[PDB]
Amino acid sequence: VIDLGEYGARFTEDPYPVYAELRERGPVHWVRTPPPEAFEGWLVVGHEEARAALADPRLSKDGTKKGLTSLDVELMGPYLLVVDPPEHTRLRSLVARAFTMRRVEALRPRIQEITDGLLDEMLPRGRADLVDSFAYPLPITVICELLGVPDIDRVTFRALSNEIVAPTGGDAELAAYERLAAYLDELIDDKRSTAPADDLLGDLIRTRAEDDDRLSGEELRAMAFILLVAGHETTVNLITNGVHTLLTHPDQLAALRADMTLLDGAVEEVLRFEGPVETATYRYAAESMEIGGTAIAEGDPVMIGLDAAGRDPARHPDPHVFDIHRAPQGHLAFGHGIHYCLGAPLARLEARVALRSLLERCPDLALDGPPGARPPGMLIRGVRRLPVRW
Ligand code: HEM
């Protein structure tokens, strides 16, 4: 066992030295995650083995095949990240068309408009927390409107969602899930009581009524859960980590400002360097198998370090150098394989628009002190707060 809680807050703040320590000793290792989680299992820290692990049919995401149960599954229902083919294939079909880049570009003007408004409000203040004034409100606004639930309670949803994704206590975690399941049941019933609506959630409602076996009521609830929660807690961090990383590497920021053409690739290099999802979600071995010649037992949990893979020097030369010209085409920030992030085109767009607009409208943007508290859970990378001035 390697208890990662033993490295304390240093690891929370900067995990990469430890991932490097481990990657030198091999591609995979049995570990205990830090508190409060304290989860035991195989952690994959090399790129090639991480990548292959992400595409491996021997790793199930569905704990109920082993009689195991979790709060998400029982209270929200089955959603994409906790199902294997063929069920996965069904559910993903329902939504995949909605999230291609071509389709998602239809939202650009609204995204640009939300971005302009938030900037209009923030800029006169001369300084702000980037997170509250900008990075948080943009994603949430966009995903609610695409879902067709524009009028939701942001503040409450964010608090419920905050707990769910980075939990503090086990009772507060349970509390969050019950309340969010109830809130989502209610929002689904609201949509059912209105005239038919041309948005994603409306489309899902209709699909279930046309054929119960294509989509159960449980799965309908759980889809809305995952789209809303991924839809915000995570693009927020990409934007925030983007700004933070640019403003702490002012030569890259200068190079970008000199050629704004470099933006899309800059965003990719942030995905590599400080990817918001640090470790991938739940997998276990469906059968006995091996990762780079280490024996893994049937039922063993496998955690794939996406960000550790991003800093593997075997894949990414000078891995700790943030270089916007690298424009890395092969990072695992969005996963790999059949579960490859559904939202990747949308998240890219949002961050693209946010960063360009923020940069063009704040030419002397600068960090206004150290950033706020990092969430515990080495499942997420980001900061609760980012004070900036301009
Ligand atoms: C910077 C932003 C984001 C990052 C870094 C990210 C990352 C990921 C990763 C790594 C996975 C795969 C995890 C695994 O295999 O265990 C994934 C899956 C997914 N993401 Fe995202 N995500 C982002 C934004 C979004 C957004 C905006 C949505 C909005 C709809 C979304 C929806 C999903 C869904 C539905 C899946 C499940 C796909 C499947 O299971 O087939 N994500 N995401």
Q: How far is CA 40 from CA 81, 145, 180, 193, in A?
A: 20, 39, 28, 46
CA of 258 to the centre of ligand 1 (A): 32
Joined together, the tokens standing for residue 381 give 């990378």
Give one DSSP letter per residue of 6-56, joined into a string.
Answer: GGHHHHHH--HHHHHHHHHT-SEEEEEPPTTT--EEEEE-SHHHHHHHHT-
Answer whether 336's CB lies under 8 Å from 78's CB: no
Residue 86: exposed, middle, or buried by beta-carbon count in 10 A (0-12, 13-18, 19+)?
A: exposed
Ligand 1 centroid–CA 343 distance in Å is 6
Given the DSSP bridges, would you call strands 289-290 and 302-304 parallel, antiparallel or unpaired?
Answer: unpaired
Question: Which residue from 70, 341, 379 has its CB within 8 A of the most atoms of ligand 1, so it is best to mutate?
Answer: 341
Q: Which residue's CA lies nearest to atom 2 of ligand 1?
A: 235
What amino acid occupies position 26? Answer: G
Q: How far is CA 260 from CA 113, 157, 175, 249, 276, in A?
A: 20, 35, 45, 16, 23
DSSP H or E run through 269: helix 263-273
Q: What is the CA radius of gyration of the chain?
A: 21
**Taking a C-beta distance cutoff of 8 angstroms, is the pair 284, 300 a contact?**
yes
What span, in angstroms and rounded, lies between the C-alpha atoms of 282 and 342?
Answer: 17
Nearest-angstrom CA–CA distance, 283 and 338? 13
232: annotated binding-site residue? no
Tell me how far apart the alpha carbons of residues 378 and 278 are, in angstroms, rounded to a whole number. 6
Atom of ligand 1 lying closest to residue 92 CA: 41
Q: For residue 291, give the DSSP letter.
A: S
Which ligand 1 atom sits closest to the C-alpha of 346? 27
Range 320-332 burial, b when 16+ CB lie within 10 A, else e: eebbbebebeebb
Backbone angles phi, psi at 40, to 5 degrees: -100, 140
What residue type is assigned to position 192 of the chain? R
Using the mean position of ligand 1's atoms as its centre, give its distance from the Cα of residue 342 in Å. 6
3-class DSSP state for residue 387?
A: strand
Say if strands 2-3 and 28-32 run parallel, antiparallel, or are unpaired.
parallel
Residue nearest to atom 17 of ligand 1 (CA): 341
Q: Which of 388, 386, 344 is nearest to 231 (CA)?
A: 344
- b/e 338-355 (16+ beta carbons within 10 angstroms → b): ebebbbbbbbbbbbbbbb
C-alpha of residue 44 to centroid of ligand 1, in Å: 19
Structural domain boundaries, residue 183: 1-390
CATH of the domain at 314: 1.10.630.10
Q: Is 381 annotated as a binding residue?
A: no
What is the C-alpha separation between 141 and 335, in angstroms, rounded? 25
CA of 334 to the centre of ligand 1 (A): 6
User: Inter-axis angle of helices 235-248 and 344-361, to 10 degrees?
Assistant: 40
Buried b (16+ CB within 10 A) or exposed e, 189-202: eebeeeeeeebbbb
Q: Atom of ligand 1 at shortest distance to CA of 338?
A: 41
Count the Cβ atoms, other than its own, within 10 Å of residue 169.
Answer: 10
Ligand 1 surroundings by CB, under 6 angstroms: 80-81, 92, 226-227, 230-231, 234-235, 238, 275-277, 280-281, 306, 333-335, 339, 341-343, 346-347
Question: Which phi and psi angles does 77 have, rounded to 5°?
Answer: 130, -175
Peptide bond into 34 cis (omega under 30): no
User: Is 92 labeled as ligand-binding?
Assistant: yes
Taking the centre of ligand 1 as the mean of its atom positions, its distance from the CA of residue 236, in whole angstroms, is 13
Amino acid in the structure at residue 383: V
316 in a known ligand binding site: no
Residue 336 marked as a ligand binder? no
Structure tokens at 385: 């707060």
Number of domains in the chain: 1
Nearest atom, ligand 1, residue 277 CA:
5
Q: Which of 112, 184, 108 is nearest to 148 (CA)?
A: 184
Give the C-alpha separation, 53 to 335, whole Å: 10
Cα 170 to Cα 36, 73, 163, 166: the distances in Å are: 9, 16, 10, 11
339 assigned ligand-binding residue:
yes
Ligand 1 centroid–CA 21 distance in Å is 28
Distance, CA of 144 to CA of 161 (rounded, Å): 14
Distances (CA, A) of 296 to 41, 56, 167, 286, 291: 10, 13, 28, 10, 7
Closest residue to atom 20 of ligand 1, CA basis: 341
Distance 286 CA to ligand 1 centre (A): 22
